Short mmCIF file of C-alpha atoms and ligand atoms in Angstrom, two decimals:
data_model
loop_
_atom_site.label_atom_id
_atom_site.label_comp_id
_atom_site.label_asym_id
_atom_site.label_seq_id
_atom_site.Cartn_x
_atom_site.Cartn_y
_atom_site.Cartn_z
CA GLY F 11 -7.26 132.81 4.56
CA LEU F 12 -9.25 135.31 6.43
CA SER F 13 -9.46 139.11 6.38
CA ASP F 14 -8.67 141.15 10.13
CA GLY F 15 -12.64 141.48 10.00
CA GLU F 16 -13.32 137.92 9.43
CA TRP F 17 -10.72 136.99 12.42
CA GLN F 18 -12.49 139.73 14.70
CA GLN F 19 -15.79 137.90 13.64
CA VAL F 20 -14.45 134.54 14.78
CA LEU F 21 -13.08 135.79 18.05
CA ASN F 22 -16.28 137.94 18.94
CA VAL F 23 -18.43 134.76 18.60
CA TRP F 24 -15.99 132.61 20.65
CA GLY F 25 -16.36 135.00 23.59
CA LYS F 26 -20.17 133.71 23.91
CA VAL F 27 -18.84 130.02 23.97
CA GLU F 28 -16.96 130.80 26.90
CA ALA F 29 -19.58 131.96 28.81
CA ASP F 30 -21.06 128.31 28.91
CA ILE F 31 -18.31 126.47 27.93
CA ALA F 32 -20.03 123.10 29.26
CA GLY F 33 -23.62 123.53 27.62
CA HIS F 34 -21.94 124.69 24.25
CA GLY F 35 -19.67 121.14 24.54
CA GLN F 36 -22.21 118.94 25.19
CA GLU F 37 -24.59 120.17 22.49
CA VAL F 38 -21.79 120.12 19.92
CA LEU F 39 -20.88 116.44 20.71
CA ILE F 40 -24.41 115.23 20.63
CA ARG F 41 -25.22 116.72 17.54
CA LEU F 42 -21.93 115.15 16.28
CA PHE F 43 -22.77 111.72 17.59
CA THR F 44 -26.57 111.69 16.23
CA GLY F 45 -25.73 112.94 12.87
CA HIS F 46 -22.57 110.91 12.25
CA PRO F 47 -22.90 107.85 14.65
CA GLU F 48 -19.49 106.23 13.39
CA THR F 49 -18.05 109.52 15.51
CA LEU F 50 -19.39 107.72 18.91
CA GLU F 51 -17.70 104.35 17.74
CA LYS F 52 -14.28 106.01 18.41
CA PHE F 53 -15.23 107.10 22.12
CA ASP F 54 -14.59 103.76 23.99
CA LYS F 55 -15.51 105.74 27.19
CA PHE F 56 -19.07 106.81 25.72
CA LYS F 57 -20.22 104.13 22.82
CA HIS F 58 -22.49 102.48 25.54
CA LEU F 59 -24.63 105.97 25.54
CA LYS F 60 -27.80 105.11 23.33
CA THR F 61 -30.02 107.78 24.13
CA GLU F 62 -30.14 111.49 23.97
CA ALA F 63 -31.26 111.19 27.52
CA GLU F 64 -28.27 108.73 28.52
CA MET F 65 -26.04 111.34 26.46
CA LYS F 66 -27.42 114.34 28.33
CA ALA F 67 -27.03 112.62 31.72
CA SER F 68 -23.37 111.56 31.17
CA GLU F 69 -20.79 113.73 33.60
CA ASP F 70 -18.06 112.63 31.48
CA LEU F 71 -19.49 113.62 27.55
CA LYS F 72 -20.16 116.96 29.30
CA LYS F 73 -16.51 117.42 30.78
CA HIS F 74 -15.32 116.13 27.22
CA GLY F 75 -17.16 118.76 25.57
CA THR F 76 -15.52 121.46 27.77
CA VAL F 77 -12.13 120.13 27.31
CA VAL F 78 -12.78 119.99 23.21
CA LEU F 79 -14.09 123.47 22.79
CA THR F 80 -11.44 125.05 25.61
CA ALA F 81 -8.50 123.29 23.07
CA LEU F 82 -10.27 124.34 20.10
CA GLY F 83 -10.51 128.05 21.37
CA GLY F 84 -6.88 128.21 22.09
CA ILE F 85 -6.11 127.20 18.59
CA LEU F 86 -8.17 129.85 17.08
CA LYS F 87 -6.85 132.42 19.42
CA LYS F 88 -3.30 131.76 18.67
CA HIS F 89 -3.99 131.37 15.14
CA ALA F 90 -5.69 134.95 14.91
CA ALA F 91 -2.48 136.15 17.06
CA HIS F 92 -0.14 134.87 14.48
CA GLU F 93 -1.97 136.32 11.61
CA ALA F 94 -2.38 139.48 13.20
CA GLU F 95 1.68 139.96 13.16
CA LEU F 96 2.34 138.04 9.75
CA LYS F 97 -0.29 139.84 7.50
CA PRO F 98 0.95 143.22 7.83
CA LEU F 99 4.62 142.27 6.75
CA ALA F 100 3.43 140.00 3.89
CA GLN F 101 1.35 143.10 2.74
CA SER F 102 4.06 145.62 2.94
CA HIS F 103 7.03 143.38 1.75
CA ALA F 104 4.48 141.87 -1.44
CA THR F 105 2.80 145.29 -2.44
CA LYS F 106 5.36 148.14 -1.47
CA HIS F 107 8.84 146.78 -1.22
CA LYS F 108 8.04 143.64 -3.78
CA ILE F 109 11.02 141.37 -1.99
CA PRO F 110 11.33 137.90 -3.79
CA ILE F 111 11.31 134.91 -1.48
CA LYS F 112 14.78 134.21 -2.69
CA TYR F 113 15.95 137.56 -0.74
CA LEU F 114 13.87 136.18 2.42
CA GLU F 115 16.01 133.07 1.84
CA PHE F 116 19.33 135.39 1.75
CA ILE F 117 18.40 137.28 5.01
CA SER F 118 17.23 133.91 6.70
CA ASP F 119 20.82 132.58 6.03
CA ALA F 120 22.46 135.88 7.34
CA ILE F 121 20.44 135.22 10.62
CA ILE F 122 21.89 131.78 10.58
CA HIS F 123 25.08 133.02 10.14
CA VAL F 124 25.30 135.92 12.53
CA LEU F 125 23.95 133.44 15.59
CA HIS F 126 26.41 130.97 14.66
CA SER F 127 29.27 133.54 14.82
CA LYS F 128 27.97 135.62 17.89
CA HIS F 129 27.28 132.35 19.97
CA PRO F 130 29.31 129.38 18.83
CA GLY F 131 29.30 127.53 22.03
CA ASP F 132 25.43 127.75 22.43
CA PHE F 133 24.30 127.84 18.96
CA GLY F 134 25.13 124.05 18.00
CA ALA F 135 23.86 122.14 14.83
CA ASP F 136 20.48 121.21 16.74
CA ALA F 137 19.66 124.58 17.51
CA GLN F 138 21.04 125.41 13.96
CA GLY F 139 18.56 123.17 12.64
CA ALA F 140 15.73 124.26 14.73
CA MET F 141 16.37 127.80 13.53
CA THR F 142 16.69 126.88 9.88
CA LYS F 143 13.28 125.09 9.85
CA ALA F 144 11.60 127.90 11.73
CA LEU F 145 12.75 130.57 9.21
CA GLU F 146 11.86 128.13 6.55
CA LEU F 147 7.97 127.90 7.90
CA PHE F 148 8.19 131.96 7.94
CA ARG F 149 9.17 132.14 4.41
CA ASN F 150 6.57 129.47 3.53
CA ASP F 151 3.72 131.50 5.73
CA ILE F 152 4.93 134.86 3.78
CA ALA F 153 4.76 133.03 0.28
CA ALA F 154 1.22 131.60 0.56
CA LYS F 155 0.15 135.44 1.66
CA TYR F 156 2.21 136.67 -1.66
CA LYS F 157 -0.03 134.19 -3.65
CA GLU F 158 -3.29 135.36 -2.04
CA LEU F 159 -2.38 139.02 -2.55
CA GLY F 160 -1.27 137.87 -6.43
CA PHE F 161 2.56 138.85 -5.70
CA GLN F 162 4.62 136.20 -7.64
CA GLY F 163 7.95 136.15 -4.50
CA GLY X 11 8.00 120.75 11.35
CA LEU X 12 9.63 121.50 14.60
CA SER X 13 9.40 119.16 17.70
CA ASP X 14 8.72 120.86 21.31
CA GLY X 15 12.59 121.06 22.24
CA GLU X 16 12.95 122.74 18.54
CA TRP X 17 10.50 125.44 19.29
CA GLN X 18 12.42 126.05 22.81
CA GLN X 19 15.44 126.40 21.43
CA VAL X 20 14.36 128.94 18.87
CA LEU X 21 12.79 131.22 21.78
CA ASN X 22 15.86 130.63 23.66
CA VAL X 23 18.46 131.81 20.92
CA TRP X 24 15.76 134.66 20.26
CA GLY X 25 16.30 136.04 24.02
CA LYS X 26 19.89 136.05 23.19
CA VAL X 27 19.22 138.42 20.24
CA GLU X 28 16.92 140.63 22.42
CA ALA X 29 19.94 141.18 24.92
CA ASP X 30 21.71 142.96 21.95
CA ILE X 31 19.34 143.53 19.37
CA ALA X 32 21.19 146.69 18.18
CA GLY X 33 24.21 144.63 17.20
CA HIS X 34 22.40 141.60 15.98
CA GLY X 35 20.36 143.66 13.63
CA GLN X 36 23.53 145.56 12.47
CA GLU X 37 25.42 142.38 11.95
CA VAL X 38 22.34 140.66 9.97
CA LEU X 39 22.03 143.59 7.46
CA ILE X 40 25.72 143.45 7.15
CA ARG X 41 26.10 139.92 6.48
CA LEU X 42 22.99 140.36 3.67
CA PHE X 43 24.47 143.34 2.05
CA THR X 44 27.72 142.06 1.83
CA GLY X 45 27.05 138.38 0.73
CA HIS X 46 24.28 139.57 -1.68
CA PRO X 47 24.96 143.20 -2.84
CA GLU X 48 21.66 143.34 -5.21
CA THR X 49 19.54 143.16 -1.89
CA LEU X 50 21.14 146.69 -0.92
CA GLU X 51 19.48 148.13 -4.15
CA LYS X 52 15.73 147.69 -2.40
CA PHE X 53 16.62 149.93 0.33
CA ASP X 54 16.91 153.74 -1.30
CA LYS X 55 18.14 155.19 2.20
CA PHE X 56 21.20 152.86 2.39
CA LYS X 57 22.05 151.68 -1.32
CA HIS X 58 25.04 153.98 -1.26
CA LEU X 59 26.64 152.35 1.73
CA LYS X 60 28.99 150.12 -0.13
CA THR X 61 31.65 149.03 2.57
CA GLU X 62 31.01 147.11 5.95
CA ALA X 63 32.48 150.18 7.74
CA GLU X 64 29.92 152.72 5.72
CA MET X 65 27.24 150.18 6.95
CA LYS X 66 28.57 149.99 10.47
CA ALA X 67 28.65 154.01 10.75
CA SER X 68 24.85 154.05 9.63
CA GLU X 69 22.63 155.13 12.72
CA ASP X 70 19.60 154.19 10.46
CA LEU X 71 20.77 150.88 9.49
CA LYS X 72 21.26 150.16 12.80
CA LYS X 73 17.51 151.08 13.59
CA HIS X 74 16.42 149.17 10.58
CA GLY X 75 18.00 145.88 11.63
CA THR X 76 16.13 146.32 15.22
CA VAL X 77 13.01 146.79 13.42
CA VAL X 78 13.65 143.61 11.37
CA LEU X 79 14.54 141.09 14.21
CA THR X 80 11.70 142.70 16.27
CA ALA X 81 9.22 141.96 13.61
CA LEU X 82 10.80 138.50 13.25
CA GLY X 83 11.00 137.74 16.95
CA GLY X 84 7.13 138.61 17.43
CA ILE X 85 6.09 136.17 14.54
CA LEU X 86 8.35 133.37 15.64
CA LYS X 87 7.05 133.49 18.91
CA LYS X 88 3.30 133.90 17.93
CA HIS X 89 4.22 130.93 15.72
CA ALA X 90 5.53 128.89 18.46
CA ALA X 91 2.59 129.37 20.48
CA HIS X 92 0.27 128.07 18.15
CA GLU X 93 2.53 125.03 17.30
CA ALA X 94 2.37 124.41 21.14
CA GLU X 95 -1.39 123.80 21.05
CA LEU X 96 -1.74 122.38 17.74
CA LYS X 97 1.11 119.78 17.99
CA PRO X 98 -0.35 117.90 21.18
CA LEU X 99 -3.68 117.57 19.64
CA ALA X 100 -2.60 116.15 16.25
CA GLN X 101 -0.29 113.82 18.03
CA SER X 102 -3.03 112.31 20.24
CA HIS X 103 -5.93 112.37 17.30
CA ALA X 104 -2.96 110.63 14.73
CA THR X 105 -1.63 108.14 17.19
CA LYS X 106 -3.88 107.01 19.90
CA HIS X 107 -7.58 108.16 18.73
CA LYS X 108 -6.84 107.88 14.92
CA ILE X 109 -9.39 110.51 14.29
CA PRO X 110 -9.78 111.17 10.27
CA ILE X 111 -9.87 114.62 8.82
CA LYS X 112 -13.59 114.01 7.72
CA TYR X 113 -14.62 113.43 11.22
CA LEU X 114 -12.90 117.03 12.05
CA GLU X 115 -15.29 118.29 9.26
CA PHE X 116 -18.47 116.51 11.00
CA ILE X 117 -17.60 118.37 14.30
CA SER X 118 -16.92 121.70 12.64
CA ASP X 119 -20.40 121.44 10.92
CA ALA X 120 -21.95 120.86 14.37
CA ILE X 121 -19.88 123.73 15.90
CA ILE X 122 -21.11 126.20 13.09
CA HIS X 123 -24.72 124.58 13.46
CA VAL X 124 -24.80 125.07 17.44
CA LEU X 125 -23.08 128.61 17.38
CA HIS X 126 -25.83 129.60 14.68
CA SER X 127 -28.74 128.08 16.97
CA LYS X 128 -27.66 129.72 20.07
CA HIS X 129 -26.39 132.83 19.12
CA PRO X 130 -28.08 133.85 16.01
CA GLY X 131 -27.79 137.59 16.89
CA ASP X 132 -24.05 137.25 16.83
CA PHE X 133 -23.51 134.82 14.12
CA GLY X 134 -24.61 136.37 10.75
CA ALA X 135 -23.89 135.16 7.12
CA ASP X 136 -20.21 136.74 7.06
CA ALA X 137 -19.49 135.71 10.76
CA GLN X 138 -20.62 131.92 9.80
CA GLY X 139 -18.44 132.36 6.79
CA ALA X 140 -15.36 133.33 8.55
CA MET X 141 -15.69 130.61 11.42
CA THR X 142 -16.10 128.07 8.17
CA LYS X 143 -12.98 129.27 6.78
CA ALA X 144 -11.14 129.35 10.18
CA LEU X 145 -12.23 125.68 10.86
CA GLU X 146 -11.17 124.58 7.37
CA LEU X 147 -7.73 126.17 8.33
CA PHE X 148 -7.45 124.31 11.63
CA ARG X 149 -8.35 121.00 9.80
CA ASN X 150 -5.56 121.66 7.26
CA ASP X 151 -2.96 122.43 9.92
CA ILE X 152 -3.96 118.97 11.64
CA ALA X 153 -3.68 117.31 8.05
CA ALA X 154 -0.09 118.77 7.56
CA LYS X 155 0.73 117.17 11.01
CA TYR X 156 -0.88 113.72 10.41
CA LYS X 157 1.19 113.81 7.18
CA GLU X 158 4.52 114.38 9.22
CA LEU X 159 3.38 111.82 11.46
CA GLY X 160 2.67 109.66 8.49
CA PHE X 161 -1.28 108.88 9.63
CA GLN X 162 -3.24 109.23 6.48
CA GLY X 163 -6.99 109.17 7.93
C1 LIG Y 205 -12.35 120.50 17.07
C2 LIG Y 205 -12.09 119.33 16.89
C3 LIG Y 205 -11.29 118.52 18.14
C4 LIG Y 205 -10.61 119.29 19.29
C5 LIG Y 205 -10.33 120.32 19.46
C6 LIG Y 205 -10.38 118.06 20.21
C7 LIG Y 205 -9.87 118.03 21.20
C8 LIG Y 205 -9.74 116.84 22.22
C9 LIG Y 205 -8.59 117.11 23.74
C10 LIG Y 205 -8.28 118.35 23.99
C11 LIG Y 205 -8.85 115.82 24.03
C12 LIG Y 205 -8.18 115.28 25.37
C13 LIG Y 205 -6.72 115.40 24.73
C14 LIG Y 205 -5.93 114.65 24.00
O1 LIG Y 205 -6.12 113.22 23.79
O2 LIG Y 205 -5.46 114.88 22.72
C15 LIG Y 205 -9.46 114.91 23.15
C16 LIG Y 205 -9.32 113.40 23.38
C17 LIG Y 205 -10.33 112.66 22.27
N1 LIG Y 205 -10.82 113.19 21.24
FE1 LIG Y 205 -10.77 114.90 20.21
N2 LIG Y 205 -11.18 116.75 19.79
C18 LIG Y 205 -11.52 117.18 18.15
C19 LIG Y 205 -12.21 116.34 17.50
C20 LIG Y 205 -12.62 114.87 17.79
C21 LIG Y 205 -13.25 113.94 16.63
C22 LIG Y 205 -14.11 114.47 15.51
C23 LIG Y 205 -13.15 112.75 17.52
C24 LIG Y 205 -13.75 111.70 17.08
C25 LIG Y 205 -14.67 111.38 16.33
C26 LIG Y 205 -11.89 112.74 18.56
C27 LIG Y 205 -11.94 111.82 19.37
C28 LIG Y 205 -11.39 112.17 20.74
C29 LIG Y 205 -11.15 110.85 21.59
C30 LIG Y 205 -11.38 109.33 21.30
C31 LIG Y 205 -10.55 111.50 22.66
C32 LIG Y 205 -10.60 110.57 23.90
C33 LIG Y 205 -10.95 110.90 24.66
C34 LIG Y 205 -11.07 110.18 26.10
O3 LIG Y 205 -11.17 108.73 26.15
O4 LIG Y 205 -11.20 110.78 27.28
N3 LIG Y 205 -11.82 114.38 18.75
N4 LIG Y 205 -9.94 115.66 21.89
C1 LIG Y 206 13.03 138.32 8.26
C2 LIG Y 206 12.82 139.02 7.16
C3 LIG Y 206 12.10 140.52 7.37
C4 LIG Y 206 11.23 141.17 8.08
C5 LIG Y 206 11.14 140.71 9.42
C6 LIG Y 206 11.55 142.27 7.92
C7 LIG Y 206 10.71 143.41 8.53
C8 LIG Y 206 10.24 144.40 7.94
C9 LIG Y 206 10.04 145.82 8.91
C10 LIG Y 206 9.23 145.69 10.24
C11 LIG Y 206 9.76 146.73 8.36
C12 LIG Y 206 9.06 148.21 8.47
C13 LIG Y 206 7.50 148.15 8.49
C14 LIG Y 206 7.04 147.71 7.07
O1 LIG Y 206 7.23 148.15 5.83
O2 LIG Y 206 6.65 146.61 6.95
C15 LIG Y 206 10.47 146.51 6.93
C16 LIG Y 206 10.70 147.46 5.70
C17 LIG Y 206 11.43 147.46 4.66
N1 LIG Y 206 11.74 145.87 4.35
FE1 LIG Y 206 11.71 144.34 5.33
N2 LIG Y 206 11.99 142.30 6.49
C18 LIG Y 206 12.42 141.40 6.03
C19 LIG Y 206 13.25 140.95 4.92
C20 LIG Y 206 13.50 141.75 3.90
C21 LIG Y 206 14.43 141.72 2.67
C22 LIG Y 206 15.09 140.41 2.56
C23 LIG Y 206 14.44 142.69 2.16
C24 LIG Y 206 15.02 143.56 0.92
C25 LIG Y 206 16.16 142.54 0.30
C26 LIG Y 206 13.34 143.94 2.66
C27 LIG Y 206 13.04 145.39 2.38
C28 LIG Y 206 12.50 146.22 3.05
C29 LIG Y 206 12.41 147.65 2.54
C30 LIG Y 206 13.02 148.19 1.38
C31 LIG Y 206 11.49 148.10 3.66
C32 LIG Y 206 11.43 149.53 3.71
C33 LIG Y 206 12.56 150.27 4.13
C34 LIG Y 206 12.36 151.85 4.21
O3 LIG Y 206 12.39 152.61 3.48
O4 LIG Y 206 12.40 152.33 5.43
N3 LIG Y 206 13.00 143.33 3.92
N4 LIG Y 206 10.95 145.39 6.90
O1 LIG Y 207 -12.48 114.91 20.92
O1 LIG Y 208 13.70 144.83 6.07
#
């Protein structure tokens, strides 16, 4: 996993990408296609482009570069933002409070119980399934941070 | 994993939690402490509160319930946001484009090289280490979605 400082380094450099996303995207795809030609064969749209000149001249390759780095920038930002809320909670619950994963399972079950009790008409079996899975992913995320911090949960 | 509709169900029910967060937080901790009395022993401020009545009268237990459901709500929303961008990418790249994880490693190499080439002043050894780890976590997240979809590589 990344520290807070490491995430800030990632977001700082992504700021530079966004100032010329089209140029960054083009250079990334040309570097990829030239180093690993089998990757170009996956693009039915582009595999006819032989020369670096033809790749640089392609409107669509340049537009696709922008699509790729736009999507990746959004994933990295949303990852960083989830980390910024998960990390402090995992830190206190591992090091200060020392809360076992089983206790996190108990409060997860309590939350599902209370939502079923307060919203019986709305919180049906499907919605309950959704919340059960989301709280399991939450517990797994905490457990992975516990491990990194060397707390046996 | 959760489907798109399942994530929306999680967000919808959290809106109902936030409409009476005091009541929800109280009832969650009461359900936890009454169902699993060993969990009360973790709370120096609360562990003397044995009955549901004593717990319901505690202004501090009610405030702590709100702190818990506020923290959890923020983490679920940030998780949903990351999933909303990761899921469609894993879906197309598994089912339509059929992109092996190794090819994601190749484009990750190209990204790091282009960032180092264009922005050496903002892409030192540490920052490069940070981006290498972030892109590996991205690949791992896609690989986990590939597995759910039963696509190997
Ligand atoms: C950082 C890594 C990557 C990102 C963020 C990314 C993102 C995207 C996005 C947003 C699209 C358009 C929407 C979609 O179909 O899902 C796309 C299309 C596509 N990607 Fe990727 N991609 C990545 C890596 C790769 C790699 C390594 C390959 C192949 C070697 C690949 C092959 C394709 C293909 C063939 C399409 C369809 C393009 C078209 O015909 O217009 N992707 N990608
Ligand atoms: C959804 C699960 C949980 C969430 C979101 C959560 C969140 C929080 C937050 C935000 C705090 C205050 C800030 C902090 O110290 O990190 C806190 C404190 C605490 N939590 Fe949790 N918590 C959870 C589960 C648990 C469980 C299951 C236990 C024990 C069985 C526990 C025990 C504590 C304790 C002892 C404190 C310190 C209380 C004080 O002295 O004021 N937590 N929790
Ligand atoms: O792509
Ligand atoms: O908590």
